[PDB]
Ligand SMILES: O=C(O)c1ccccc1CN1C(=O)Cc2ccccc21
Ligand SMILES: O=C(O)c1ccccc1CN1C(=O)Cc2ccccc21
């Protein structure tokens with residue numbers, strides 16, 4: 558459970574925003590890419606897994622689930638690849654809500670940056686530091702530290 | 707001390723590898739860029755600070771120390787920008803050693819990837835997971851979780 562992440566893909570300004578959410582904490586990492594390909598998704602997971610102890614990834618769609626490049630990256634990084642089928646139906650609406658929230662934050666910072674990618678990273682910052690009184694950033698560290706001990 | 711990071715820039719295949727090291731743990735994040743500019747460095751710090759609680763950054767050289775774009779990014783992200791002058795002389799040789807080690811790991815994986823950026827991320831993975839018996843990845847989480855409590 559401290560090792561579970563969910564992939565999520567959303568669109569803005571004719572570009573793709575790839576998101577990984579740490580399910581237990583709500584902590585996210587994100588990147589802007591021209592389009593969702595197996596190679597981009599594989600590279601993103603490789604980055605994620607070098608930064609956080611990723612055990613399981615729920616993929617965002619069947620193309621990334623099937624992608625041989627994605628499967629190779631998960632093998633390389635010791636990640637168990639799974640489907641992201643909302644067996645809990647709450648799950649899809651939660652993602653939708655996260656995408657709406659992220660896009661809201663992007664809109665609030667959009668004018669402070671020329672390039673979308675910069676605005677996305679600012680939104681990641683704001684999302685992860687937001688107090689809700691712990692932040693997502695604090696929760697993920699606490700969850701994983703507890704798990705290490 | 708749990709909030710202190712050090713910037714480091716090194717070169718390979720005619721490209722630049724930008725590294726941030728969490729001083730207390732030895733944990734790293736890295737990226738490949740065409741060349742070290744204020745804008746690239748600023749973006750890299752924005753990414754870092756949205757992912758980890760960055761309080762202080764020792765910059766890697768005087769150009770990044772002076773850069774108005776870097777200073778703006780540190781202001782935005784609540785980061786105290788400092789010089790990286792090795793007042794402890796131990797410090798410069800430690801960086802050198804890290805660069806040598808990273809390049810060694812890059813060489814060991816280089817043939818498994820077409821693009822240098824992929825090899826760099828694989829090396830970050832290997833570096834952060836290496837048992838030394840805790841890993842850098844485990845140490846950074848422990849250090850910061852302890853600090854939160
Ligand atoms: O405008 C951009 O997209 C961009 C790209 C790379 C670095 C900085 C920026 C924009 N920017 C500044 O110039 C100052 C600044 C502070 C904080 C965030 C972004 C920026
Ligand atoms: O060759 C590359 O640079 C590159 C770029 C993006 C994604 C995957 C790769 C290479 N690669 C695969 O195709 C399989 C694989 C597993 C693990 C890491 C990289 C790769």
Ligand SMILES: [Cl-]
Pocket residue numbers: 573592593
């Ligand atoms: Cl797409």
